[PDB]
C-alpha cells in the first residue's frame, strides 16, 4: 502493498536535478542576483522528500457529535461537547477493548496500554499509548486525547504527521462511540 497510497505520483528523478548557480559577472560588468518570479528562496529544510513524504490528507478530528467543536494542537486532540460524560467515555474505551493501566475516577483521567491500530493504507501498523480525560471546561465539557507514545514496527515515532493522524484516530473512536448512544 500500500505504499502507492501514501506516496506522490511519478518518480524521484527530480531529486537528481543539478543545483542552480548565480551567474558570475566579468570585470567591467555587474549582474543582478536572481530575482522576481522564478527566484527560489533558500531553505535548507528539512522534511521528507520524494517517496518518503506521506501525502495523505492531515487527520483533523471529527465532530461526530451534534453541536460540538473539535481541535488539534501538538499531540493533543480534543472535543467540546455541549456532565457525567466520564463514565460514557470509559465505556467506549472498554467497549473497544483498550486496556486501561491507571484510572483516576475523581480526576476523570486515565492512561491506556498500547492500543493496536489497523488500517488498509498502512503497511506496518501503528500502536499508540494514550492519556484520555474529561475536563469540566464550561459548561460545556472537553474530552481530550493525548498521544503519549507512538510505535511502528516496534520503533518509536515522533514526526508531526503521524502523531496527528493517530491522536486523531483515538479521538474519532471516542466521538463515534459517544454518538452511537447519545
Amino acid at each position: 502493498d500500500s505504499r502507492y497510497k501514501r506516496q506522490v505520483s511519478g518518480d524521484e528523478a527530480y531529486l537528481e536535478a543539478a543545483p542552480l548557480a548565480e551567474l558570475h559577472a566579468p570585470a567591467g560588468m555587474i549582474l543582478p542576483v536572481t530575482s522576481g518570479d522564478y527566484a527560489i528562496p533558500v531553505t535548507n529544510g528539512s522534511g521528507a522528500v520524494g517517496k518518503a513524504l506521506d501525502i495523505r490528507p492531515p487527520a483533523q478530528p471529527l465532530a461526530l457529535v451534534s453541536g460540538a467543536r473539535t481541535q488539534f494542537t501538538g499531540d493533543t486532540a480534543s472535543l467540546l461537547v455541549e456532565n457525567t460524560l466520564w463514565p460514557q467515555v470509559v465505556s467506549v474505551l472498554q467497549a473497544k477493548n483498550y486496556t486501561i493501566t491507571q484510572r483516576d475516577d475523581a480526576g476523570q483521567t486515565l492512561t491506556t496500554d498500547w492500543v493496536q491500530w489497523n488500517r488498509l493504507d498502512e503497511d506496518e501498523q501503528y500502536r499508540g499509548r494514550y492519556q484520555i480525560s474529561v475536563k469540566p471546561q464550561g459548561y460545556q465539557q472537553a474530552v481530550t486525547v493525548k498521544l503519549l507514545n507512538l510505535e511502528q514496527a516496534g520503533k518509536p515515532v515522533a514526526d508531526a504527521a503521524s502523531m496527528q493522524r493517530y491522536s486523531t484516530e483515538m479521538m474519532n473512536v471516542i466521538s463515534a462511540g459517544l454518538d452511537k448512544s447519545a
Binding site: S9, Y14, T43, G47, A48, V49, P58, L62, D121
Partner: protein, 217 residues
C-alpha cells in the same frame, strides 16, 4: 448513485473505500456527502479527502477545482499548506503525462505549460509557508522545474537560430537572462546569443556575451 444513509455512515464508507485505494468509489461517496451536507460538521475533511482522492485517481483538473474552492473558503486553515502542495503535485502530474504521451515523438519546443503552473503553485507554498512540512520537497521540485522551463527557452532559441531569425534569438535569450540566469540551459544559450549578434554584425554586444561565457567556464 449513492444511497440515502446518514452523513456519518457515508463518511465511514468513504473512509474504507479510501484506505482501500479504491478512488472512484471514495469520490462518489465524498461527492454525495459534500453536495448533500455542505454545512456539514466535518466538511473540510471531506474536501481534503476528495483533493487527495482526485490526485490518486488522476482527476487532476477536478482535484484543482476542489483545491481552489477550499482555499477560498478556508484562507486561514491549519492545513492550507497541504492543499497548496497538492495543487503543485497536480500540475506536475499533468506535465509528466504530457511528456509521456509524446514519447519518441515530441518537439523540444512543446510548451511545458503545466510545469510553469506547478512552478507558480509551489512558490506560493514556499514563500507563504517556509516552515511547512512540504516545503523541502516543493523546493526540490521548483529546482527541477526551473531547469525544465529554461530548457524550453533554449529549444526555442535554437529553433530560431537554425533559421537565421537573429532578433527572435537575442530577444529569447535575453528573456532567459532576465528570468533563469542561474540555470544550465541559460549557460548553453549564450553561445546562441553570441552567434546571433556576430551575424547581425554587432560586435560590441557579441563580445560582451563572450566575456560572460568565459567568466562562467
Amino acid at each position: 448513485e449513492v444511497p440515502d444513509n446518514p452523513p456519518n455512515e457515508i463518511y465511514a464508507t468513504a473512509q474504507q473505500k479510501l484506505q482501500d485505494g479504491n478512488w472512484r468509489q471514495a469520490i462518489t461517496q465524498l461527492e454525495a456527502l459534500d453536495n448533500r451536507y455542505p454545512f456539514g460538521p466535518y466538511s473540510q475533511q471531506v474536501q481534503l479527502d476528495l483533493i487527495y482522492a482526485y490526485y490518486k485517481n488522476a482527476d487532476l483538473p477536478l482535484a484543482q477545482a476542489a483545491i481552489d474552492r477550499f482555499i477560498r473558503l478556508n484562507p486561514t486553515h491549519p492545513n492550507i499548506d497541504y492543499v497548496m502542495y497538492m495543487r503543485g503535485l497536480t500540475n506536475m502530474a499533468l506535465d509528466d503525462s504530457a511528456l509521456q504521451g509524446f514519447f519518441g515523438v515530441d518537439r523540444s519546443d512543446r510548451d511545458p505549460q503545466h510545469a510553469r503552473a506547478a512552478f507558480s503553485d509551489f512558490s506560493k507554498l514556499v514563500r507563504g509557508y517556509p516552515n511547512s512540512q512540504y516545503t523541502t520537497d516543493a523546493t526540490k521540485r521548483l529546482v527541477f522545474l526551473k531547469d525544465r522551463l529554461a530548457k524550453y527557452e533554449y529549444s526555442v532559441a535554437e529553433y530560431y537560430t537554425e533559421r537565421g531569425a537573429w532578433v527572435a534569438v537575442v530577444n529569447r535569450v535575453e528573456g532567459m537572462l532576465r528570468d533563469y540566469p542561474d540555470t544550465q540551459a541559460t549557460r548553453d544559450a549564450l553561445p546562441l546569443m553570441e552567434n546571433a549578434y556576430r551575424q547581425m554584425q554587432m560586435n560590441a554586444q557579441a563580445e560582451k556575451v563572450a566575456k560572460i561565457i568565459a567568466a562562467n567556464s
